[PDB]
Amino acid sequence: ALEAGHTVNPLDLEGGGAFRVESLERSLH
Amino acid sequence: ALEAGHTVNPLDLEGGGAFRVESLERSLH
Amino acid sequence: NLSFTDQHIKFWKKIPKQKAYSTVEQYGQLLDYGRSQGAFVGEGVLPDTNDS
Amino acid sequence: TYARKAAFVKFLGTTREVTHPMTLVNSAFGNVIARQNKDGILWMLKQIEQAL
Amino acid sequence: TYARKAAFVKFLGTTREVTHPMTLVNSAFGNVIARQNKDGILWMLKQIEQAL
Numbered sequence: 001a002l003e004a005g006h007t008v009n010p011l012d013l014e015g016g017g018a019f020r021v022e023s024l025e026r027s028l029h
Numbered sequence: 030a031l032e033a034g035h036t037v038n039p040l041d042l043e044g045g046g047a048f049r050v051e052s053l054e055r056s057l058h
Numbered sequence: 059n060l061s062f063t064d065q066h067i068k069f070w071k072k073i074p075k076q077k078a079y080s081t082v083e084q085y086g087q088l089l090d091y092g093r094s095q096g097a098f099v100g101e102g103v104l105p106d107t108n109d110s
Numbered sequence: 111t112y113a114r115k116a117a118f119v120k121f122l123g124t125t126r127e128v129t130h131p132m133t134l135v136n137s138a139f140g141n142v143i144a145r146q147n148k149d150g151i152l153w154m155l156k157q158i159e160q161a162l
Numbered sequence: 163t164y165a166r167k168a169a170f171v172k173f174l175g176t177t178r179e180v181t182h183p184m185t186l187v188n189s190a191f192g193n194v195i196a197r198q199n200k201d202g203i204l205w206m207l208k209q210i211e212q213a214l
Contacts, residue, residue, distance in 0.1 A: 004080070004081045004082075006081060006082065007082075008038070008039055008040060008082060009037070009038050009039075010037055010038075010039075010051075010166050010168065011037060011166055011167075011168065013164075013165075013166045014163075014164065014165075015164065018164040018165065018166055019164075020080055020081070020082075021051075021053060021079075021080070022039075022051050022080070022082070022084055023078065023079045023080040023082065023083050023084060024050070024084040024085070024086070024138065025083075025084070025085045025086070026138060026139070027139070028086055028087075028088055028138075028139040029085060029086065029087045029088065030107050030109050030126070030127050030128070030129075031109065031127070031128045031129065031132055031142065031146060032129040032131070032132055033129075033131060033132050033135055035170045037168050039084060044109070045128075045129075045132050045142070047086055048132075048137050048138055048139060048142060049135060049136070049137075049138065050136045050137070050138045052136070086138065086139065091149040091150075091152045091153040091156070092124070092149060092150065092153035094157075097122045097123070097124060097154065097157040097158070097161065098120060098121060098122055099121055099122070099123050100121060101121060104125065105123035105124050105125045106124070106125060107124075107125045107126065107127060108124055108125070108126065108150070108153065110146075110149045110153075131173070
């Protein structure tokens with residue numbers, strides 16, 4: 001069951017969470 | 030005064046760490 | 059038909075749409091331009107530093 | 111009746127600084143130096159506006 | 163099973179100084195600034211080699 005379970009900390013990623021690059025907006029608010 | 034630290038948790042960025050795009054190697058070891 | 063239809067939807071067609079590339083989406087905010095610590099220094103005196 | 115009065119010029123200032131490694135790393139929102147300069151200028155403008 | 167890891171960058175440095183009159187006297191072994199730079203570079207090389 002490969003899935004991304006809403007994990008934010010990069011050092012706690014497991015399973016499908018490790019196959020995730022960050023999505024960050026490039027325009028400051 | 031404005032410096033880049035060693036914070037890894039995205040929610041703990043406070044100073045110059047908030048300006049850092051993550052650097053990830055795209056090869057799986 | 060005795061119920062609603064497509065034309066009765068308002069807020070769903072007004073909110074802007076953006077494409078997501080992950081299950082977590084990050085963004086950055088600017089809150090302050092600096093601390094409120096006094097601007098007057100005196101003649102020939104180096105002013106103090108400040109941080110946003 | 112006549113009178114003579116005087117006014118004294120006052121001084122304002124602030125300091126901003128950035129470490130050398132901060133300029134060498136990748137930045138998400140453009141040049142850090144320009145952003146800091148803009149922040150300092152806006153903070154000074156607000157301080158002068160409130161001191162008036 | 164998968165995992166994620168991080169590595170932290172560190173900083174090394176040294177400082178060399180030469181007085182003004184020393185730069186005006188005649189030298190028997192060429193320019194002195196180049197000698198100081200060479201000594202600093204070799205010292206840094208040794209420190210890095212043992213820190214590794």
